RNA sequence: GCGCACCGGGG
RNA sequence: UCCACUGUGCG
RNA sequence: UACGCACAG
RNA sequence: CUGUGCG
């Protein structure tokens, strides 16, 4: 059929009219190979001809470039709002009348009317929007029936159509549904986007009122900056600067800022950090251990000597629980009497227990525990009861007190039983006894007295002599201290949930209330330790910081302290986790020979540090451990910043912090001593993980007001230092502030250095005119560009970056809303109201505590300079009692983004929701604008703070309009920066390349530079960006779009320059109160911080600082992409300058301010030879960075040992695990609301932890801790929460569903095997589409057990036994989800509609409203551990119809049936056995149970759909022989195994079209009114179609669980850092009767194996001679033809066709194909120049060279250029490349001018010339040859004619002038230069397919151990050298492709295959390879000097190729 | 024994 | 009455 | 499509 | 109106 295709191509070429506008599509037709793609292209060409003739007839010009209506109107100068994306075929504009023409061809009357109405509706969409801007739209639809046109004869058209359809029929028979519904829709699938308007140009809509201020600023930007310098001038200036800098540095007038690393000096500096506060320098370990156990009350309690009925339960506990549950009902008759009755009942129960068995529980001396966690005394209880009984007896008037008391007790108990029995539980659940009600209860409790200790609380620090226990009993090696800490932390956390009952009585009076308090009434929690019973006693409720005491019945007041209860969570139920963490950290350095005598001390120090940070979670204790990271990073480097030691020191207060510092110093001295030089990497990572312990403390702030004040000080201080602070700016700017802005703009550009007398001034904000000019000139003249950045023209970002939808700014994050008084928004606080509020607050706070000068003044002030305050307060309070005053001082409010967006959309009449519509085309929109902002007001931000691990950080919050404008700027700058290489902020491939380059640099021991910058945000300014932009030229030959783009961006940047920032209200109030106190003499003096001075100076004159505007600060992350772009260009220039000075080269990667720099061999050699020159080069780099307003942080390090980039460390070829960070992350209080959400969040966190080197043995412990936390809340553990016996493969190759499958298989083995077999067979049948009927509704949408049995028996396998079907699990919320406690249409169709309707205004409004409602509902739910515990056991279960029940009610109902049998495992997973004979009649409770087998089958099927079929195999545990003893710190990078390729991925289009073709009514009524001509119109076809339709039908019919969601998802590919020992001990799922996939895999493996033993030609017989070959099986379809690679297009078209022929190259292009071309820079010829009159001395610069070339005969200029074309197919495996060469002969005109006289064209490739001209026409479509783009010439030849090299870059921009007619080559001017050889059949050599001495494509399947074993057995038996060669070739080929052998164990494979010759074979193979090769958990190499094989190990001793290694065999 | 901008919190 | 702009990953 | 959490700038 | 639970 290739002949038919050739005939079609020839007839199309020689019969189609040669029209230029038809060429491009014609080019798309002559390159396709698939018959369906060829038919689509032919039909598209016919439609193009039809529409072009139609538009020519109607007069409308053709839309050849496919621009939208808005783009077309913009090109004509019409300003229109954002419109729906519609691309008309033709357009015509007449003044104000727009005519749009769309042409289509339909030969089916049924398929004709709907297209017409669809086009009419599409035009009516734009009609109203066009009318809104006063433009009349006249739709014009041209429908036809026949493909007849004047562009081609009718007969040839008919023949072409018939031949195309016949070829489609004859080529492949897969889907013959090409009726006039599919192919006609497929024809218009060429709606590729050419870019959309950004919306920045819409600023032209408003009036322009820019004035002298704007032009003055612009002139200041252009004052003394020259951006037209050549390379020679900038080179000279750089040389001068370097010479002067080096001279002044050597002479000593400039400081170094860098020091060479001296380990002894660093250790000495670290030891003397706090030299003025610690007495000694070399502490004793034993003395430190002695001091540790006696430092604080908590530490003393943890290590003190303390110590059957405890397990036993008495009546007191039962009565307390029952009374608590009853009181929960809140009878609320009278709280006092109810509490008295409860206390009396509890006392009676306690008396009964003591009388019976003499129990001592529930009593603490003379007090006992009441119902509501109340510790109360018996004296008050008996007195109150006697008084109440006497009053009642004397008011009822004969009955005595006992009778009335018993009557009241019985009445209360009866009422409680009646109120409790109704819901789900009677009194029998609480095993109470009614015997406690005695006939003489009143007399029994009236004479009862108990003696004991008195509970107390100490509010002040006292001596340590009062501790009643020995303080050193517990050892540090045991885990007793951790368990005690866990119990204490749980008590502290539970202390927060005590409800605030009636206020307790006053225990003390006066000052004695804060010295020692005897507790008569208090609150207490109970915890048991080692058999004892302790009470935590407090007096205050809530989450605030408070004082606690620990009491015991034997002796009271063990210890009292202060604590914040919400900081002690991580220690709860985590005692084994921390012990295992410490054990692993110690075992990391266990094999160090010099540390063998210090292991015990190291373990003790580590455990002491961990316990200390857990027990005392201080903020300032968190920063020392963080700075330890930078210390250890600088320790192993070569050079470091000289301010590192100053940065390390942090202020400390308490003695615990100093003890922590001493412990850290001792540990560092022990580890990093001078006589230990054995294992540097292990000690380095040990110290790093010690440093990372700071994550264990918290992230939330300790105090809010202090944090806000610190952040404001950080924000304000640098501005005050600079000298520009404008106070209270107005919407209408004043003259003085504008003058100040201009003056500071001039000052910012006046930085000087290295030339002035004073010299450089480091760490000063500003930029230098000289270096700014040099940077701009270097960018403009093209010396910063690479050869790969000029292959294509630069697109204009103004018309190539799309706009942002309104829903891109929608979230729950806060946003500011302004307050308007009458017509203008308020911007200033009121002084009088503020001071009145401050006075009121002072009086209130003194009244609550003050119960001397201070007392007199406060009591005088409470009666409302001094007279002014009196008058103001009297006038305000009387005429304005605190709530409204407090709310009337604020000047702004907060809300959500969604609410603001909905309010804005409510005021827009447009159809689409875009940012440009909201900004400009709105009812409340600006009319004009100025330099300071639009007329609606200046841009506004407000200050806030952030919670993080470390120091403070301020944040800016803007309103909606400022956010929109900032988003516009960010999008523009992101589009601008996307066109240059080296930025990793928005490019993950760049990040991967950076990581690979860093690893390669470290492996070669080159110098590396890790850099961060100090205060990147608060130092950058928008003025710097504006100045840089005003001097840059992007389109050097299109200076018309650049002007307007720069103007718009400059206006926006000036708006950002004139922003106003709002000070927080709390800060202002605090400062006002401080000022009032200080002015009155109450406060002290002296310190008087600068911020306080500023506030006081403003207050004295009577001004409240409300807003501050300055030129210096740029928001924290507000302008991120602009900063990234500036950093990129600045670093490029700095590297260029460094390369100009020295001879070396630097490769740099930056993201925002983090940077990694890699030096080449030259710089490393220079460092090794000439240290002074290297150091001064570093100095010059620092100086140049400082000159460009970039300050290097003291955290930067230069060295050859360790590299790091964005927290990814690499040391000497090893991976650095981050264990402590993620261990601490997984142990924190995650804010969750339901158990399943918590379980999945913990699972995600544990997966992330496993990805970062945490062993699974500890992740299992973390999961067990989470399950224990769930069990504490008394929640049943279903088998769908967590898996606690996972392996490495469970996390690397499996998702959550796979883990659930593993757990279910573990629970019930020997029963899931039959289910797996049935599922395997069913999936195999379904993939071929076999049944597709029974599974739809007969089984899936039906009953469960019977349908499961029927499905199992249908396939021919044995059904599960009756015992298996009884297994079930208790599914709570089986009807409605759980009801949390508040403290204050098919689903697929809905999802599609939500995705598609997000662009339109109405759909956006609906989505915003529903999201607002959902967020409001969610935000009022109690979260955290306390909230989750309170929610559970609080009537959370929803009943059948509508009711709420306790979990205890359900459990009791289940317990009332004797057939249900519970079953539990070791880990606590509980399931049930429910026989089928009791499933009828008791339907009330059986509805909560679900069978396990059905859920297992569903989950397994979904996992097989998502991951692959391998999950259906039989799992097994392998017994692997261990041959090498790995070090406990030997890690390995691993890649998850993938099985889904790019052609198996399903997108939105497939689902939409399936819905259209399956449910036309639903598609028409839900999807149709939301369809535009967007990318959704594209129709792509995949082999997975029938199965996708089945899944869509299943999802539509039933909404139980999603099934199509698992198809649009794939397994992520990413590195995992795992342990070798754990990796080698994982389970395996093998695959096992003929399957198409198995057959094709076997065939591919056979071909791959036989490709190395011998070579053969890929004929039709050789491929058919193999045993495994799909000889036209029953159901091949496309499932078996896609896993074939290059042969996929051959066997279907040649093997299964009765055709005998060899395979050629043309049978290697599968899928849709398209071409892409690149233009290389032109090159000179050395010989031609030298033989034309250019002989003599070399020239000084490029200008001299061009002048010399100019003075030549007019034909002496000869250049050569090459254009490279590449054809790529949809199945990207082989690209067809060719090229065309152009020789230009002409003369060089004045300077940068090139006049072309003659052009010669040649070509080289394997492409027929019949299409070449067309390809050339494509090149003529670009603006390069039209003079609208830059033309570049290579500089390699030019450097041979220059005296001074290292002066130019790689390209030079030279404009070219040439007539267009000379460039129109037509099919005959091209002359071939290649060999012109006939096509040759391919040869199957090693690896892949080889052409004639050229490797085109390669195939490489996956090889297992069995296949390699059998291949070795087959090959090595014949000969050994052949086996060696084959193995070496395979290893080298796979290593060249960057692949790992992580699925094969070569050592054991060779041991098993060849028991006696494994060593020699391995040695020979590795010697042949001679490189590091990664295998299944280990890497091997061969050493030349020592003729052996080395294995990589961190515990090794030898060095080899940049890795530590040791001998494999001893 | 909290916070530890002197200023807050701790029946 | 309180917490911003981005990037990666998962549900 | 949203929402929620972890890590990083 | 909502917890009494130490694997």
PDB file of C-alpha atoms in Angstrom, chain A residues 904-1046:
ATOM      1  CA  UNK A 904     -16.418  42.192  42.076  1.00  0.00           C
ATOM      2  CA  UNK A 905     -18.062  39.776  39.626  1.00  0.00           C
ATOM      3  CA  UNK A 906     -21.462  41.027  40.788  1.00  0.00           C
ATOM      4  CA  UNK A 907     -20.538  44.419  39.255  1.00  0.00           C
ATOM      5  CA  UNK A 908     -19.389  43.203  35.812  1.00  0.00           C
ATOM      6  CA  UNK A 909     -21.598  42.934  32.721  1.00  0.00           C
ATOM      7  CA  UNK A 910     -19.059  40.939  30.694  1.00  0.00           C
ATOM      8  CA  UNK A 911     -19.502  37.294  29.718  1.00  0.00           C
ATOM      9  CA  UNK A 912     -16.046  35.952  30.634  1.00  0.00           C
ATOM     10  CA  UNK A 913     -14.332  36.333  34.013  1.00  0.00           C
ATOM     11  CA  UNK A 914     -10.826  37.646  33.335  1.00  0.00           C
ATOM     12  CA  UNK A 915      -8.556  40.000  35.250  1.00  0.00           C
ATOM     13  CA  UNK A 916      -8.702  42.624  32.494  1.00  0.00           C
ATOM     14  CA  UNK A 917     -12.509  42.639  32.625  1.00  0.00           C
ATOM     15  CA  UNK A 918     -12.488  43.225  36.387  1.00  0.00           C
ATOM     16  CA  UNK A 919      -9.717  45.839  36.323  1.00  0.00           C
ATOM     17  CA  UNK A 920     -10.959  48.032  33.464  1.00  0.00           C
ATOM     18  CA  UNK A 921     -14.393  46.969  32.162  1.00  0.00           C
ATOM     19  CA  UNK A 922     -16.378  47.261  35.378  1.00  0.00           C
ATOM     20  CA  UNK A 923     -18.908  49.633  36.904  1.00  0.00           C
ATOM     21  CA  UNK A 924     -16.519  50.612  39.723  1.00  0.00           C
ATOM     22  CA  UNK A 925     -13.445  51.002  37.536  1.00  0.00           C
ATOM     23  CA  UNK A 926     -10.873  53.795  37.175  1.00  0.00           C
ATOM     24  CA  UNK A 927     -11.459  56.460  34.540  1.00  0.00           C
ATOM     25  CA  UNK A 928      -7.928  57.881  34.300  1.00  0.00           C
ATOM     26  CA  UNK A 929      -4.529  57.259  35.886  1.00  0.00           C
ATOM     27  CA  UNK A 930      -1.342  59.050  36.888  1.00  0.00           C
ATOM     28  CA  UNK A 931       2.242  58.287  37.900  1.00  0.00           C
ATOM     29  CA  UNK A 932       1.203  57.570  41.507  1.00  0.00           C
ATOM     30  CA  UNK A 933      -1.620  55.191  40.575  1.00  0.00           C
ATOM     31  CA  UNK A 934      -5.150  55.203  39.172  1.00  0.00           C
ATOM     32  CA  UNK A 935      -7.696  57.811  40.188  1.00  0.00           C
ATOM     33  CA  UNK A 936      -9.419  55.279  42.475  1.00  0.00           C
ATOM     34  CA  UNK A 937      -6.471  55.407  44.887  1.00  0.00           C
ATOM     35  CA  UNK A 938      -2.867  54.338  45.370  1.00  0.00           C
ATOM     36  CA  UNK A 939      -1.840  50.728  45.894  1.00  0.00           C
ATOM     37  CA  UNK A 940      -2.160  49.616  49.512  1.00  0.00           C
ATOM     38  CA  UNK A 941      -0.615  46.868  51.632  1.00  0.00           C
ATOM     39  CA  UNK A 942      -0.869  45.970  55.313  1.00  0.00           C
ATOM     40  CA  UNK A 943       1.748  44.434  57.590  1.00  0.00           C
ATOM     41  CA  UNK A 944       1.539  41.029  59.260  1.00  0.00           C
ATOM     42  CA  UNK A 945       3.840  38.323  60.622  1.00  0.00           C
ATOM     43  CA  UNK A 946       4.665  34.697  59.841  1.00  0.00           C
ATOM     44  CA  UNK A 947       5.082  31.516  61.878  1.00  0.00           C
ATOM     45  CA  UNK A 948       8.219  29.556  61.004  1.00  0.00           C
ATOM     46  CA  UNK A 949      11.156  27.649  62.464  1.00  0.00           C
ATOM     47  CA  UNK A 950      13.719  30.370  63.109  1.00  0.00           C
ATOM     48  CA  UNK A 951      13.681  34.158  63.156  1.00  0.00           C
ATOM     49  CA  UNK A 952      10.963  36.656  62.364  1.00  0.00           C
ATOM     50  CA  UNK A 953       9.594  37.581  58.944  1.00  0.00           C
ATOM     51  CA  UNK A 954       7.122  40.268  57.894  1.00  0.00           C
ATOM     52  CA  UNK A 955       4.386  39.814  55.294  1.00  0.00           C
ATOM     53  CA  UNK A 956       2.415  42.165  53.047  1.00  0.00           C
ATOM     54  CA  UNK A 957      -1.327  41.784  52.441  1.00  0.00           C
ATOM     55  CA  UNK A 958      -2.884  43.752  49.597  1.00  0.00           C
ATOM     56  CA  UNK A 959      -6.433  44.422  48.479  1.00  0.00           C
ATOM     57  CA  UNK A 960      -8.047  42.973  45.362  1.00  0.00           C
ATOM     58  CA  UNK A 961      -6.973  45.611  42.824  1.00  0.00           C
ATOM     59  CA  UNK A 962      -3.349  45.650  43.984  1.00  0.00           C
ATOM     60  CA  UNK A 963      -3.312  41.851  43.779  1.00  0.00           C
ATOM     61  CA  UNK A 964      -4.676  41.985  40.221  1.00  0.00           C
ATOM     62  CA  UNK A 965      -2.057  44.504  39.084  1.00  0.00           C
ATOM     63  CA  UNK A 966       0.726  42.562  40.807  1.00  0.00           C
ATOM     64  CA  UNK A 967      -0.480  39.383  39.093  1.00  0.00           C
ATOM     65  CA  UNK A 968      -0.328  41.142  35.721  1.00  0.00           C
ATOM     66  CA  UNK A 969       3.245  42.291  36.391  1.00  0.00           C
ATOM     67  CA  UNK A 970       4.298  38.840  37.618  1.00  0.00           C
ATOM     68  CA  UNK A 971       2.830  37.092  34.575  1.00  0.00           C
ATOM     69  CA  UNK A 972       4.576  39.520  32.223  1.00  0.00           C
ATOM     70  CA  UNK A 973       7.952  39.065  33.907  1.00  0.00           C
ATOM     71  CA  UNK A 974       7.546  35.279  34.083  1.00  0.00           C
ATOM     72  CA  UNK A 975       6.888  35.206  30.339  1.00  0.00           C
ATOM     73  CA  UNK A 976       9.918  37.455  29.832  1.00  0.00           C
ATOM     74  CA  UNK A 977      12.197  35.227  31.936  1.00  0.00           C
ATOM     75  CA  UNK A 978      10.922  31.988  30.368  1.00  0.00           C
ATOM     76  CA  UNK A 979      13.016  32.764  27.263  1.00  0.00           C
ATOM     77  CA  UNK A 980      16.417  32.383  28.967  1.00  0.00           C
ATOM     78  CA  UNK A 981      18.190  29.359  30.426  1.00  0.00           C
ATOM     79  CA  UNK A 982      19.535  28.985  33.955  1.00  0.00           C
ATOM     80  CA  UNK A 983      16.451  29.707  36.112  1.00  0.00           C
ATOM     81  CA  UNK A 984      14.859  26.920  38.159  1.00  0.00           C
ATOM     82  CA  UNK A 985      11.948  28.871  39.667  1.00  0.00           C
ATOM     83  CA  UNK A 986       9.408  27.785  37.020  1.00  0.00           C
ATOM     84  CA  UNK A 987      11.286  24.948  35.294  1.00  0.00           C
ATOM     85  CA  UNK A 988      11.650  21.540  36.944  1.00  0.00           C
ATOM     86  CA  UNK A 989      13.824  20.208  34.112  1.00  0.00           C
ATOM     87  CA  UNK A 990      16.288  23.008  34.852  1.00  0.00           C
ATOM     88  CA  UNK A 991      16.293  21.959  38.515  1.00  0.00           C
ATOM     89  CA  UNK A 992      17.016  18.346  37.545  1.00  0.00           C
ATOM     90  CA  UNK A 993      19.852  19.485  35.276  1.00  0.00           C
ATOM     91  CA  UNK A 994      21.240  21.623  38.105  1.00  0.00           C
ATOM     92  CA  UNK A 995      21.192  18.662  40.500  1.00  0.00           C
ATOM     93  CA  UNK A 996      22.916  16.414  37.956  1.00  0.00           C
ATOM     94  CA  UNK A 997      25.566  19.049  37.210  1.00  0.00           C
ATOM     95  CA  UNK A 998      26.189  19.574  40.931  1.00  0.00           C
ATOM     96  CA  UNK A 999      26.654  15.840  41.498  1.00  0.00           C
ATOM     97  CA  UNK A1000      29.010  15.597  38.515  1.00  0.00           C
ATOM     98  CA  UNK A1001      31.012  18.582  39.779  1.00  0.00           C
ATOM     99  CA  UNK A1002      31.378  17.042  43.239  1.00  0.00           C
ATOM    100  CA  UNK A1003      32.394  13.671  41.780  1.00  0.00           C
ATOM    101  CA  UNK A1004      35.314  15.349  39.968  1.00  0.00           C
ATOM    102  CA  UNK A1005      36.519  17.224  43.097  1.00  0.00           C
ATOM    103  CA  UNK A1006      36.046  20.635  41.484  1.00  0.00           C
ATOM    104  CA  UNK A1007      35.392  23.823  43.437  1.00  0.00           C
ATOM    105  CA  UNK A1008      31.749  24.552  44.253  1.00  0.00           C
ATOM    106  CA  UNK A1009      30.096  27.707  45.581  1.00  0.00           C
ATOM    107  CA  UNK A1010      26.830  27.627  47.544  1.00  0.00           C
ATOM    108  CA  UNK A1011      25.324  31.093  47.939  1.00  0.00           C
ATOM    109  CA  UNK A1012      22.402  32.765  49.644  1.00  0.00           C
ATOM    110  CA  UNK A1013      21.764  36.501  49.837  1.00  0.00           C
ATOM    111  CA  UNK A1014      21.084  38.623  52.909  1.00  0.00           C
ATOM    112  CA  UNK A1015      17.637  40.258  53.005  1.00  0.00           C
ATOM    113  CA  UNK A1016      16.792  39.674  49.355  1.00  0.00           C
ATOM    114  CA  UNK A1017      13.285  41.087  49.748  1.00  0.00           C
ATOM    115  CA  UNK A1018      13.673  44.165  51.965  1.00  0.00           C
ATOM    116  CA  UNK A1019      16.674  45.361  49.902  1.00  0.00           C
ATOM    117  CA  UNK A1020      15.349  45.100  46.342  1.00  0.00           C
ATOM    118  CA  UNK A1021      13.202  47.994  45.151  1.00  0.00           C
ATOM    119  CA  UNK A1022      10.813  48.480  42.218  1.00  0.00           C
ATOM    120  CA  UNK A1023      12.921  51.468  41.152  1.00  0.00           C
ATOM    121  CA  UNK A1024      15.865  49.172  40.410  1.00  0.00           C
ATOM    122  CA  UNK A1025      13.644  47.005  38.207  1.00  0.00           C
ATOM    123  CA  UNK A1026      12.314  50.102  36.432  1.00  0.00           C
ATOM    124  CA  UNK A1027      15.832  51.436  35.822  1.00  0.00           C
ATOM    125  CA  UNK A1028      16.984  48.066  34.486  1.00  0.00           C
ATOM    126  CA  UNK A1029      13.935  47.783  32.218  1.00  0.00           C
ATOM    127  CA  UNK A1030      14.337  51.305  30.817  1.00  0.00           C
ATOM    128  CA  UNK A1031      17.793  50.402  29.447  1.00  0.00           C
ATOM    129  CA  UNK A1032      17.162  46.886  28.078  1.00  0.00           C
ATOM    130  CA  UNK A1033      16.191  46.166  24.467  1.00  0.00           C
ATOM    131  CA  UNK A1034      14.668  42.771  23.678  1.00  0.00           C
ATOM    132  CA  UNK A1035      13.458  43.128  20.066  1.00  0.00           C
ATOM    133  CA  UNK A1036      16.454  44.943  18.582  1.00  0.00           C
ATOM    134  CA  UNK A1037      14.886  45.064  15.090  1.00  0.00           C
ATOM    135  CA  UNK A1038      11.240  45.698  16.097  1.00  0.00           C
ATOM    136  CA  UNK A1039      11.445  48.976  18.007  1.00  0.00           C
ATOM    137  CA  UNK A1040       7.704  49.662  17.970  1.00  0.00           C
ATOM    138  CA  UNK A1041       6.258  47.030  20.313  1.00  0.00           C
ATOM    139  CA  UNK A1042       9.175  47.485  22.716  1.00  0.00           C
ATOM    140  CA  UNK A1043       8.326  51.159  23.257  1.00  0.00           C
ATOM    141  CA  UNK A1044       4.709  50.543  24.257  1.00  0.00           C
ATOM    142  CA  UNK A1045       5.503  47.437  26.301  1.00  0.00           C
ATOM    143  CA  UNK A1046       8.198  49.302  28.222  1.00  0.00           C
TER     144      UNK A1046
END
